[PDB]
């Protein structure tokens, strides 16, 4: 029942995300050359989303079998991929938001900033910045066997003297730098962009251009709402279990895995929001 529907949801999200990301990557590689900054950002976002989606079947297997049957090296690389690509996807979303804000609200500086070379430099900086968490997950990640339960679990290993403190600090740091900063940046940038576009003479000139402005506002609101709805529940759940109270129930476990599923649904839906809705991408596809 629930397990069955839970794994069905996981499989559907995995398939949709993988297919969409692969299609976007294939279109960007061959059909549309990466000459603009936005194409480079979309390619990096699609790559990060695909690599995050690759992690999903292992988590589904852990949910079903209640144990980790793979090797220690595979667990380390899977954990590192998950953390690194989550950070890369979130930072790419944030940088796309900042890029569009700079394009609208700072048109003069956008000529000196939206160069494809600077986009590649920004992407390299993003990947290097996520490399810190990736290396941390490689070094500390692993698999350990618990004897009284006879269960092999794959996670990040910390010294047992202050394992709880290290885990809580890591959760707080990840929550901050992956939710609080990106959400605030996206909100501020998109709000300023919309406020500036409200004062553009072109958009308010005609009824059809007002319709175009309404469409742009709807797209921005959809992007922000999707990000918030997909990422807030899992982070709130993790924080509540880390500091609020500790409990273990079947319903709690099912809701936890559904929150993880929503977190992955964010990356699954990113190609639809950013690639299959850009007008330039639509023209290139047709």
């Amino acid at each position: 029942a629930i397990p069955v529907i839970i794994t069905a949801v996981y499989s559907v999200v995995f398939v949709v995300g993988l297919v969409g990301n692969s299609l976007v990557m294939f279109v960007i590689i061959r059909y549309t050359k990466m000459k603009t900054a936005t194409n480079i950002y979309i390619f990096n976002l699609a790559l990060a989303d695909a690599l995050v989606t690759t992690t999903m079947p292992f988590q589904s297997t852990v949910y079903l079998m209640n144990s980790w049957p793979f090797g220690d090296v595979l667990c380390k690389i899977v954990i590192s991929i998950d953390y690194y690509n989550m950070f890369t996807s979130i930072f790419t979303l944030t940088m796309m938001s900042v890029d569009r804000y700079i394009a609208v609200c700072h048109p003069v500086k956008a000529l000196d900033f939206r160069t494809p070379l600077k986009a590649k430099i920004i992407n390299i900086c993003i990947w290097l910045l996520s490399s810190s968490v990736g290396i941390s997950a490689i070094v500390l990640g692993g698999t350990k066997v618990r004897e009284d339960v006879d269960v092999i679990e794959c996670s990040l290993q910390f010294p047992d003297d202050d394992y709880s403190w290290w885990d809580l600090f890591m959760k707080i740091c990840v929550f901050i730098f992956a939710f609080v900063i990106p959400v605030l940046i996206i909100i501020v940038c998109y709000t300023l962009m919309i406020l500036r576009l409200k004062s553009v003479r072109l958009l308010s000139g005609s009824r059809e251009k007002d319709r175009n402005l309404r469409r742009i506002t709807r797209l921005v609101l959809v992007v922000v709402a999707v990000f918030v709805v997909c990422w807030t529940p899992i982070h709130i759940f993790i924080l509540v279990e880390a500091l609020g109270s500790t409990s273990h129930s079947t319903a709690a476990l099912s809701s936890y895995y559904f929150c993880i599923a929503l977190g992955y649904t964010n990356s699954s839906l990113n190609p639809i929001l950013y690639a299959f809705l850009d007008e330039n991408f639509k023209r290139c596809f047709r």
Partner: peptide, 9 residues
């Protein structure tokens, strides 16, 4: 995220 944390179950 969250699928690789030390859960009790």
């Amino acid at each position: 995220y969250g699928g690789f944390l030390r859960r009790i179950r």
